[PDB]
Design a binder for this molecule. Structure first.
Ligand SMILES: Oc1c(Cl)cc(Cl)cc1Sc1cc(Cl)cc(Cl)c1O
Ligand SMILES: Oc1c(Cl)cc(Cl)cc1Sc1cc(Cl)cc(Cl)c1O
Ligand SMILES: [Zn+2]
Length: 258
């Protein structure tokens, strides 16, 4: 009876195993665009993905992760609200059963069809497992997906999903360039928060881009063909793998733009 996104094990239940679910810096949140304060002291973000080394794509039963070699400073996030160097470890998405839901963060209560999370850890802590124990351990770049024109740089991901339909399946996934998933603008909102999945650790500096990327209806339809279940188990489509907005509590969302 482990955690998931069902009626019986979904986000409203998580606090029984993970009491930090009701903590002071949980994610995601609604971004109230009128209340977010422009912070002229924030820097431009530095996304340095030219030497990124993708390795593998995994269906872990709650999403699919594209994993990177994070044993050296190849794909790093710096600048913006961040102190020091954060190494890309994986990206994944959250999405809906229909185009009107799927994102974890919302913007003036608007839900996007999906949300991409590029997960990075602070090199001062040496490894990901140590970094998630620190209040400045992770930096997650969040990007909203809307349905419209196809995203060219997403198609290599969509094309391999048939090979990882069920929980525990993986495939080689080399030479993938995450720069093809970024919007034109790096204008962002930032706030201190948490992992949006158990163990819900309060270790994340969130950096959520204002400009969504456009994906095609066919691209997101292929996400919705994945399965939460393992091979030979009753089919449960991997949809609505999003946690809803959590209380902002004693936090300020800052904007990088006027
Ligand atoms: O082994 C882990 C590391 Cl290095 C970091 C984190 Cl945040 C969690 C684990 S194990 C783990 C994985 C998932 Cl998907 C959910 C839970 Cl509740 C876990 O403890
Ligand atoms: O090369 C591409 C073109 Cl002409 C249009 C779009 Cl919308 C995506 C791509 S990227 C790509 C994706 C896969 Cl699955 C295979 C190959 Cl040979 C690609 O170049
Ligand atoms: Zn996520």
């Amino acid at each position: 009876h482990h955690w998931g996104y069902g009626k019986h094990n979904g986000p409203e239940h998580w606090h029984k195993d993970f009491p930090i679910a009701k903590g002071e810096r949980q994610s995601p949140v609604d971004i109230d665009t009128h209340t977010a304060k422009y912070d002229p002291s924030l820097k431009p973000l530095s996304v340095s993905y030219d030497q990124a080394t993708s390795l593998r794509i995994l269906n872990n039963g709650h999403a699919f992760n594209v994993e990177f070699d994070d044993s050296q400073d190849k794909a790093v996030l710096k600048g913006g609200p961040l102190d020091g160097t954060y190494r890309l470890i994986q990206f994944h998405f959250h999405w809906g059963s229909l185009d009107g839901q799927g994102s974890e963060h919302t913007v003036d209560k608007k839900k996007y069809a999906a949300e991409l999370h590029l997960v990075h850890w602070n090199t001062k802590y040496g490894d990901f497992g140590k970094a998630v124990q620190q209040p400045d351990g992770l930096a997650v770049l969040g990007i909203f997906l809307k349905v419209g024109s196809a995203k060219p740089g997403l198609q290599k991901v969509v094309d391999v999903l048939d090979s990882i339909k069920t929980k525990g399946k993986s495939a080689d996934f080399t030479n993938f360039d995450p720069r093809g998933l970024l919007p034109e603008s790096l204008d962002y909102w930032t706030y201190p928060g948490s992992l949006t999945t158990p163990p819900l650790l309060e270790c994340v500096t969130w950096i959520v881009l204002k400009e969504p990327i456009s994906v095609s209806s066919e691209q997101v339809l292929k996400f919705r063909k994945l399965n939460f279940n393992g091979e030979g188990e009753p089919e449960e489509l991997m949809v609505d793998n999003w946690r809803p907005a959590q209380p902002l509590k004693n936090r300020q969302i800052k904007a990088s733009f006027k």
